[PDB]
């Protein structure tokens, strides 16, 4: 088995904007979004290829779970805004949480909040405790640690419930998540007549996103002067590219290397 993750982004606004739900929720399996929810419709909706999967989750039931989470989340926002007494300005709270498994063993988890884009509070499950980054998070910390069972429940969600949901979802999502699309490659060059040649290598049309694209000079990896990535959200493919500068007096042979999980071995594309 490989690495899999289940992650969530919850976002909440203190100030109503027309046609924008105050509370918005997104869930992801690896880099693919599988469900959404908002405060207008108040319904857990599957997304993408999970619209055609049956039995993974009871979405009607999960909508009740999300309503409950909405109320506690928005109450936390309300408390922060009341702490600063800016009850007429626009403010945002974002919570992010999730877990990971590799080789079917838990390999990570996190649970963090941001207020107006800055670190607010995070759960450190190894202590265990909520760690505040902002004066107002002292009040939130104390509500969430008012009884010694709350911390243990928080730890247990990250270490037991989140991985159990992930393992459940994998039995239904394995084909979707194990998609292997191999990269195609394009190599480019340009130069002023007798000056530094710029060589660019681009891998594209690939999934999953993890990849290593690099130039070698006679086998030795070169440091790019420029690099970049692309994600086409629609078809769910990626691209990744690097540029190196080659002195006009450099005669060594350059190749582009592409290491990706869909390949038996790295693609090596010489530039001649
Ligand atoms: C800003 N830079 C680095 C770029 C220039 C041109 C296209 C680029 C694309 S793209 O998605 O539009 N490219 C798709 C190419 C696939 C078809 C192969 C035809 C040859 C492409 C010319 C090489 C190139 O400019 O990358 C994506 C990202 C960066 C691009």
């Amino acid at each position: 088995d490989g690495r899999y993750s289940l992650t969530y982004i919850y976002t909440g606004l203190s100030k109503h904007v027309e046609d924008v739900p105050a509370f918005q929720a997104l869930g992801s399996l690896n880099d693919l979004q599988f469900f959404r929810y908002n405060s207008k419709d108040r319904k857990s909706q599957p997304m993408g290829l999970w619209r055609q999967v049956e039995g993974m989750e009871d979405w009607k039931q999960d909508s009740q779970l999300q309503k409950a989470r909405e109320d506690i989340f928005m109450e936390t926002l309300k408390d922060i805004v009341e702490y600063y007494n800016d009850s007429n300005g626009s403010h945002v709270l974002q919570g992010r949480f999730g877990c990971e498994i590799e080789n079917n063993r838990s390999s990570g988890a996190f649970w963090k909040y941001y207020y107006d884009g800055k670190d607010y509070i995070e759960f450190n499950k190894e202590i265990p405790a909520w760690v505040p980054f902002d004066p107002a998070a002292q009040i939130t910390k104390q509500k969430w640690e008012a009884e010694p069972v709350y911390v243990q429940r928080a730890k247990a969600y990250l270490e037991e419930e989140c991985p159990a949901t992930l393992r459940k979802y994998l039995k239904y999502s394995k084909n979707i998540l194990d998609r292997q699309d191999p990269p195609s490659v394009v190599v480019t060059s340009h130069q002023a007549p007798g000056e530094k040649k710029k060589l660019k290598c681009l891998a594209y049309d690939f999934y999953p996103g993890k990849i290593d694209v690099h130039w070698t000079r006679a086998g030795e990896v070169q440091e790019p002067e420029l690099r970049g990535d692309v994600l086409h959200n629609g078809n769910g493919t990626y691209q990744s590219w690097v540029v190196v500068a080659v002195p006009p007096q450099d005669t060594a042979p350059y190749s582009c290397h592409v290491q990706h999980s869909s390949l038996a071995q790295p693609l090596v594309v010489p530039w001649e």
Side-chain angles (χ1 to χ4, degrees), residues 128-186:
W130 289 95
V131 174
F133 301 108
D134 171 73
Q138 297 297 338
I139 284 68
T140 311
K141 172 172 170 129
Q142 207 153 30
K143 296 190 186 207
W144 297 353
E145 304 178 341
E147 297 208 39
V149 73
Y150 299 166
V151 164
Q152 187 189 35
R153 267 180 198 157
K155 187 175 170 67
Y157 167 81
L158 287 189
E159 298 184 346
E160 314 177 42
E161 298 296 309
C162 180
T165 305
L166 173 50
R167 292 189 180 97
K168 192 184 64 176
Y169 292 174
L170 287 183
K171 293 185 298 206
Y172 289 86
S173 306
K174 222 62 149 297
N175 288 348
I176 293 164
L177 295 176
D178 293 347
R179 195 168 56 91
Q180 288 290 334
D181 289 358
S184 306
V185 178
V186 170

Coordinates of all heavy atoms in Angstrom, one line a residue, residues 128-186:
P128 N -0.7 16.0 25.3 CA -1.5 16.7 24.3 C -2.1 18.0 24.8 O -2.3 18.1 25.9 CB -2.7 15.7 24.0 CG -2.8 15.0 25.3 CD -1.4 14.8 25.8
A129 N -2.2 19.0 23.8 CA -2.8 20.3 24.2 C -3.1 21.1 22.9 O -2.5 20.9 21.9 CB -1.8 21.0 25.1
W130 N -4.0 22.1 23.1 CA -4.2 23.2 22.1 C -3.1 24.2 22.4 O -3.0 24.7 23.5 CB -5.6 23.7 22.2 CG -6.6 22.8 21.7 CD1 -7.4 22.0 22.5 CD2 -7.1 22.6 20.4 NE1 -8.2 21.2 21.7 CE2 -8.1 21.6 20.4 CE3 -6.7 23.2 19.2 CZ2 -8.7 21.2 19.2 CZ3 -7.3 22.8 18.0 CH2 -8.3 21.8 18.0
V131 N -2.4 24.6 21.3 CA -1.3 25.6 21.4 C -1.8 26.9 20.7 O -2.1 26.9 19.5 CB -0.1 25.0 20.5 CG1 1.0 26.1 20.4 CG2 0.4 23.7 21.2
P132 N -1.9 28.0 21.6 CA -2.4 29.2 21.0 C -1.3 30.1 20.4 O -0.2 30.1 20.9 CB -3.0 29.9 22.3 CG -2.1 29.4 23.4 CD -1.7 28.0 23.0
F133 N -1.7 30.8 19.3 CA -0.8 31.7 18.7 C -1.2 33.2 18.7 O -0.6 34.1 18.2 CB -0.6 31.3 17.2 CG -0.1 30.0 17.0 CD1 -0.9 28.9 16.6 CD2 1.3 29.7 17.3 CE1 -0.4 27.6 16.4 CE2 1.8 28.4 17.1 CZ 0.9 27.4 16.7
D134 N -2.3 33.5 19.4 CA -3.0 34.8 19.4 C -3.7 34.9 20.8 O -4.3 33.9 21.3 CB -4.1 34.7 18.3 CG -5.0 35.9 18.3 OD1 -4.6 37.0 18.0 OD2 -6.2 35.8 18.6
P135 N -3.6 36.1 21.5 CA -4.3 36.3 22.8 C -5.7 35.7 22.9 O -5.9 35.2 24.0 CB -4.3 37.9 22.8 CG -3.2 38.3 22.0 CD -2.9 37.3 21.0
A136 N -6.5 35.9 21.9 CA -7.9 35.4 22.0 C -8.0 33.9 22.0 O -9.0 33.4 22.5 CB -8.7 36.0 20.8
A137 N -7.0 33.2 21.4 CA -7.0 31.7 21.5 C -6.8 31.2 22.9 O -7.0 30.0 23.1 CB -5.9 31.2 20.6
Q138 N -6.4 32.0 23.8 CA -6.3 31.6 25.3 C -7.7 31.3 25.8 O -7.9 30.3 26.5 CB -5.7 32.7 26.1 CG -4.2 33.1 25.9 CD -3.3 31.9 26.1 OE1 -3.6 31.0 26.9 NE2 -2.1 32.0 25.5
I139 N -8.7 32.1 25.3 CA -10.1 31.8 25.7 C -10.6 30.6 25.0 O -11.3 29.8 25.7 CB -11.0 33.1 25.4 CG1 -10.8 34.2 26.5 CG2 -12.5 32.7 25.5 CD1 -9.4 34.8 26.5
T140 N -10.3 30.4 23.8 CA -10.7 29.2 23.0 C -10.1 27.9 23.6 O -10.7 26.9 23.8 CB -10.4 29.3 21.5 OG1 -10.9 30.5 21.0 CG2 -11.1 28.2 20.7
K141 N -8.8 28.1 23.9 CA -8.0 27.0 24.5 C -8.7 26.5 25.8 O -8.7 25.3 26.1 CB -6.6 27.4 24.9 CG -5.8 26.4 25.7 CD -4.3 26.9 25.8 CE -3.6 26.1 26.8 NZ -2.3 25.5 26.3
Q142 N -9.1 27.5 26.6 CA -9.7 27.1 27.9 C -11.1 26.5 27.8 O -11.4 25.6 28.6 CB -9.7 28.4 28.8 CG -9.7 28.1 30.3 CD -9.1 29.1 31.2 OE1 -9.1 30.3 30.9 NE2 -8.4 28.7 32.3
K143 N -11.9 26.9 26.8 CA -13.2 26.2 26.6 C -13.0 24.8 26.1 O -13.7 23.9 26.5 CB -14.1 27.0 25.5 CG -14.5 28.3 26.0 CD -15.6 28.9 25.0 CE -15.9 30.3 25.3 NZ -17.3 30.7 24.9
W144 N -12.0 24.6 25.2 CA -11.7 23.3 24.6 C -10.9 22.4 25.5 O -10.8 21.2 25.2 CB -11.1 23.5 23.2 CG -11.9 24.2 22.1 CD1 -13.2 24.6 22.3 CD2 -11.5 24.6 20.8 NE1 -13.6 25.2 21.1 CE2 -12.6 25.2 20.2 CE3 -10.3 24.5 20.1 CZ2 -12.6 25.7 18.9 CZ3 -10.2 25.0 18.8 CH2 -11.4 25.6 18.2
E145 N -10.4 22.9 26.6 CA -9.7 22.1 27.6 C -10.4 22.3 29.0 O -9.7 22.1 30.0 CB -8.2 22.5 27.7 CG -7.4 22.3 26.4 CD -6.0 22.8 26.5 OE1 -5.6 23.5 27.5 OE2 -5.1 22.4 25.7
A146 N -11.6 22.7 29.0 CA -12.4 22.9 30.3 C -12.5 21.6 31.1 O -12.6 21.7 32.4 CB -13.7 23.6 30.1
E147 N -12.7 20.5 30.4 CA -12.8 19.2 31.1 C -11.6 18.4 30.5 O -11.4 18.4 29.2 CB -14.1 18.5 30.8 CG -15.3 19.2 31.3 CD -16.5 18.2 31.6 OE1 -16.2 17.1 32.1 OE2 -17.7 18.6 31.4
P148 N -10.9 17.6 31.3 CA -9.8 16.8 30.8 C -10.1 15.7 29.7 O -9.2 15.2 29.1 CB -9.2 16.1 32.0 CG -10.2 16.2 33.1 CD -11.2 17.3 32.7
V149 N -11.4 15.3 29.6 CA -11.8 14.4 28.5 C -11.9 15.0 27.1 O -11.8 14.3 26.1 CB -13.2 13.8 28.9 CG1 -14.3 14.8 28.7 CG2 -13.4 12.5 28.0
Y150 N -12.0 16.4 27.0 CA -12.0 17.1 25.7 C -10.7 16.8 24.9 O -10.8 16.5 23.7 CB -12.3 18.5 25.9 CG -13.6 19.0 26.5 CD1 -13.7 20.3 27.0 CD2 -14.7 18.1 26.7 CE1 -14.9 20.7 27.6 CE2 -15.8 18.5 27.3 CZ -16.0 19.8 27.7 OH -17.1 20.2 28.3
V151 N -9.6 17.1 25.5 CA -8.3 16.9 24.9 C -8.1 15.4 24.5 O -7.6 15.1 23.4 CB -7.1 17.3 25.9 CG1 -5.8 16.7 25.5 CG2 -7.0 18.8 26.0
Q152 N -8.6 14.5 25.3 CA -8.5 13.0 24.9 C -9.4 12.7 23.7 O -9.0 11.9 22.9 CB -8.8 12.2 26.2 CG -8.5 10.7 26.0 CD -9.0 9.8 27.1 OE1 -10.1 10.1 27.8 NE2 -8.3 8.7 27.4
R153 N -10.5 13.2 23.7 CA -11.4 13.1 22.5 C -10.8 13.7 21.2 O -11.0 13.2 20.2 CB -12.8 13.7 22.8 CG -13.8 12.8 23.3 CD -15.2 13.5 23.6 NE -16.1 12.7 24.5 CZ -17.0 13.3 25.2 NH1 -17.3 14.6 25.2 NH2 -17.8 12.5 26.0
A154 N -10.2 14.9 21.4 CA -9.5 15.5 20.2 C -8.4 14.7 19.7 O -8.3 14.4 18.5 CB -9.0 16.9 20.7
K155 N -7.6 14.2 20.6 CA -6.5 13.2 20.2 C -7.1 11.9 19.6 O -6.6 11.5 18.6 CB -5.7 12.8 21.5 CG -4.5 11.9 21.3 CD -3.8 11.7 22.6 CE -2.7 10.7 22.6 NZ -1.5 11.1 21.8
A156 N -8.2 11.4 20.1 CA -8.8 10.2 19.6 C -9.5 10.4 18.2 O -9.5 9.5 17.5 CB -9.9 9.7 20.6
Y157 N -10.0 11.6 17.9 CA -10.5 11.9 16.6 C -9.3 11.8 15.6 O -9.4 11.0 14.6 CB -11.2 13.3 16.5 CG -11.5 13.6 15.0 CD1 -12.5 13.1 14.3 CD2 -10.5 14.4 14.3 CE1 -12.7 13.4 13.0 CE2 -10.7 14.7 13.0 CZ -11.8 14.2 12.3 OH -12.0 14.4 11.0
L158 N -8.3 12.5 15.8 CA -7.1 12.5 14.9 C -6.4 11.1 14.8 O -6.0 10.7 13.7 CB -6.0 13.5 15.4 CG -6.3 15.0 15.2 CD1 -5.1 15.8 15.5 CD2 -6.8 15.2 13.7
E159 N -6.3 10.4 15.9 CA -5.6 9.1 15.9 C -6.4 7.9 15.7 O -5.9 6.8 15.3 CB -4.8 8.9 17.3 CG -3.8 9.9 17.5 CD -2.9 9.8 18.7 OE1 -3.3 9.0 19.6 OE2 -1.9 10.4 18.8
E160 N -7.7 8.0 15.8 CA -8.6 6.8 15.7 C -9.7 7.0 14.6 O -9.9 6.2 13.8 CB -9.2 6.3 17.0 CG -8.3 6.2 18.1 CD -8.9 5.8 19.5 OE1 -9.8 4.9 19.5 OE2 -8.5 6.4 20.5
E161 N -10.5 8.1 14.8 CA -11.7 8.3 14.0 C -11.4 8.7 12.5 O -11.9 8.1 11.5 CB -12.7 9.3 14.5 CG -13.2 8.9 15.9 CD -14.1 7.7 15.8 OE1 -15.0 7.6 15.0 OE2 -13.8 6.7 16.6
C162 N -10.4 9.6 12.4 CA -10.0 10.1 11.1 C -9.4 9.0 10.2 O -9.8 8.8 9.1 CB -9.1 11.3 11.2 SG -8.6 12.0 9.6
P163 N -8.4 8.2 10.8 CA -7.9 7.1 10.1 C -8.9 6.0 9.7 O -8.8 5.3 8.7 CB -6.9 6.5 11.0 CG -6.4 7.6 11.8 CD -7.6 8.5 11.9
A164 N -9.9 5.8 10.6 CA -11.0 4.8 10.3 C -11.9 5.2 9.2 O -12.2 4.4 8.3 CB -11.8 4.5 11.6
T165 N -12.3 6.5 9.2 CA -13.0 7.0 8.0 C -12.2 6.9 6.7 O -12.7 6.4 5.7 CB -13.4 8.5 8.3 OG1 -14.2 8.6 9.5 CG2 -14.3 9.0 7.1
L166 N -10.9 7.3 6.8 CA -10.0 7.2 5.6 C -10.0 5.7 5.1 O -10.2 5.5 3.9 CB -8.6 7.7 6.0 CG -7.5 7.5 5.0 CD1 -7.9 8.0 3.6 CD2 -6.2 8.2 5.5
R167 N -9.7 4.7 6.0 CA -9.7 3.3 5.6 C -11.0 2.9 5.0 O -11.1 2.1 4.0 CB -9.3 2.4 6.8 CG -7.9 2.5 7.2 CD -7.5 1.5 8.3 NE -6.1 1.7 8.6 CZ -5.7 2.3 9.7 NH1 -6.5 2.9 10.6 NH2 -4.4 2.4 9.9
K168 N -12.2 3.3 5.6 CA -13.5 3.0 5.0 C -13.6 3.6 3.6 O -13.9 2.8 2.6 CB -14.6 3.6 5.9 CG -16.0 3.1 5.5 CD -17.1 3.7 6.2 CE -17.2 5.2 6.0 NZ -18.4 5.8 6.7
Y169 N -13.2 4.9 3.4 CA -13.3 5.5 2.1 C -12.3 4.9 1.0 O -12.7 4.9 -0.2 CB -13.0 7.0 2.2 CG -14.0 7.9 2.9 CD1 -13.7 9.2 3.2 CD2 -15.3 7.4 3.3 CE1 -14.7 10.0 3.8 CE2 -16.2 8.2 3.9 CZ -15.9 9.5 4.2 OH -16.8 10.3 4.8
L170 N -11.2 4.3 1.5 CA -10.3 3.6 0.5 C -10.9 2.4 -0.1 O -10.6 2.2 -1.3 CB -9.0 3.3 1.2 CG -8.0 4.4 1.5 CD1 -6.8 3.8 2.1 CD2 -7.7 5.2 0.2
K171 N -11.7 1.6 0.6 CA -12.3 0.5 0.1 C -13.3 0.8 -1.1 O -13.6 -0.1 -1.9 CB -13.1 -0.3 1.2 CG -12.2 -0.9 2.2 CD -13.0 -1.8 3.2 CE -14.0 -1.0 4.0 NZ -14.3 -1.6 5.3
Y172 N -13.7 2.0 -1.1 CA -14.6 2.6 -2.2 C -13.9 3.4 -3.2 O -14.4 3.6 -4.3 CB -15.7 3.4 -1.6 CG -16.7 2.5 -0.8 CD1 -16.5 2.1 0.5 CD2 -17.9 2.0 -1.5 CE1 -17.4 1.3 1.2 CE2 -18.8 1.2 -0.8 CZ -18.6 0.9 0.5 OH -19.5 0.1 1.2
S173 N -12.7 4.0 -2.9 CA -12.0 5.0 -3.7 C -10.7 4.6 -4.3 O -10.1 5.4 -5.0 CB -11.8 6.2 -2.8 OG -13.0 6.7 -2.3
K174 N -10.3 3.4 -4.1 CA -9.0 2.9 -4.5 C -8.7 3.1 -6.0 O -7.6 3.5 -6.4 CB -8.8 1.3 -4.2 CG -7.5 0.9 -3.7 CD -7.2 1.5 -2.3 CE -6.3 0.7 -1.4 NZ -7.1 -0.6 -1.0
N175 N -9.6 2.8 -6.9 CA -9.5 3.0 -8.3 C -9.3 4.4 -8.7 O -8.4 4.7 -9.5 CB -10.6 2.3 -9.1 CG -10.6 0.8 -9.1 OD1 -9.6 0.2 -8.7 ND2 -11.7 0.2 -9.6
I176 N -10.1 5.3 -8.2 CA -10.0 6.7 -8.4 C -8.7 7.3 -7.9 O -8.1 8.0 -8.6 CB -11.2 7.5 -7.6 CG1 -12.5 7.1 -8.2 CG2 -11.0 9.0 -7.7 CD1 -13.7 7.5 -7.4
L177 N -8.2 6.9 -6.7 CA -7.0 7.4 -6.1 C -5.7 6.9 -6.6 O -4.7 7.5 -6.5 CB -7.1 7.3 -4.6 CG -8.2 8.1 -3.9 CD1 -8.1 7.8 -2.4 CD2 -8.1 9.6 -4.1
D178 N -5.8 5.7 -7.2 CA -4.6 5.0 -7.8 C -4.4 5.2 -9.3 O -3.5 4.6 -9.9 CB -4.6 3.5 -7.5 CG -4.5 3.2 -6.0 OD1 -4.1 4.1 -5.2 OD2 -4.7 2.0 -5.6
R179 N -5.2 6.1 -9.9 CA -5.0 6.6 -11.3 C -3.5 6.9 -11.5 O -2.8 7.6 -10.7 CB -5.8 7.8 -11.6 CG -5.9 8.1 -13.0 CD -7.0 9.2 -13.3 NE -7.0 10.6 -12.7 CZ -6.5 11.7 -13.1 NH1 -5.8 11.7 -14.3 NH2 -6.6 12.8 -12.4
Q180 N -2.9 6.3 -12.6 CA -1.5 6.6 -13.0 C -1.6 7.0 -14.4 O -1.9 6.2 -15.3 CB -0.7 5.3 -12.9 CG -0.4 4.9 -11.5 CD 0.6 5.8 -10.8 OE1 1.5 6.4 -11.4 NE2 0.6 5.8 -9.4
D181 N -1.4 8.3 -14.7 CA -1.3 8.9 -16.1 C 0.1 9.3 -16.3 O 0.7 10.1 -15.6 CB -2.2 10.1 -16.2 CG -3.6 9.9 -16.2 OD1 -4.0 8.7 -16.1 OD2 -4.4 10.9 -16.3
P182 N 0.8 8.6 -17.3 CA 2.2 8.9 -17.5 C 2.5 10.3 -18.2 O 1.6 10.7 -18.9 CB 2.7 7.7 -18.4 CG 1.5 7.4 -19.2 CD 0.3 7.6 -18.3
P183 N 3.6 10.9 -17.8 CA 4.0 12.2 -18.4 C 4.4 12.1 -19.8 O 5.3 11.3 -20.2 CB 5.1 12.7 -17.5 CG 5.7 11.5 -17.0 CD 4.6 10.4 -16.8
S184 N 3.9 13.0 -20.7 CA 4.6 13.4 -21.9 C 5.6 14.5 -21.7 O 5.5 15.2 -20.7 CB 3.5 13.8 -22.9 OG 2.5 12.9 -23.0
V185 N 6.6 14.6 -22.6 CA 7.7 15.5 -22.4 C 7.9 16.4 -23.6 O 7.7 15.9 -24.7 CB 9.0 14.8 -22.0 CG1 10.2 15.7 -21.9 CG2 8.8 13.9 -20.8
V186 N 8.2 17.7 -23.4 CA 8.6 18.6 -24.4 C 9.9 19.3 -23.9 O 9.9 19.8 -22.8 CB 7.5 19.7 -24.6 CG1 8.1 20.9 -25.5 CG2 6.3 19.1 -25.3

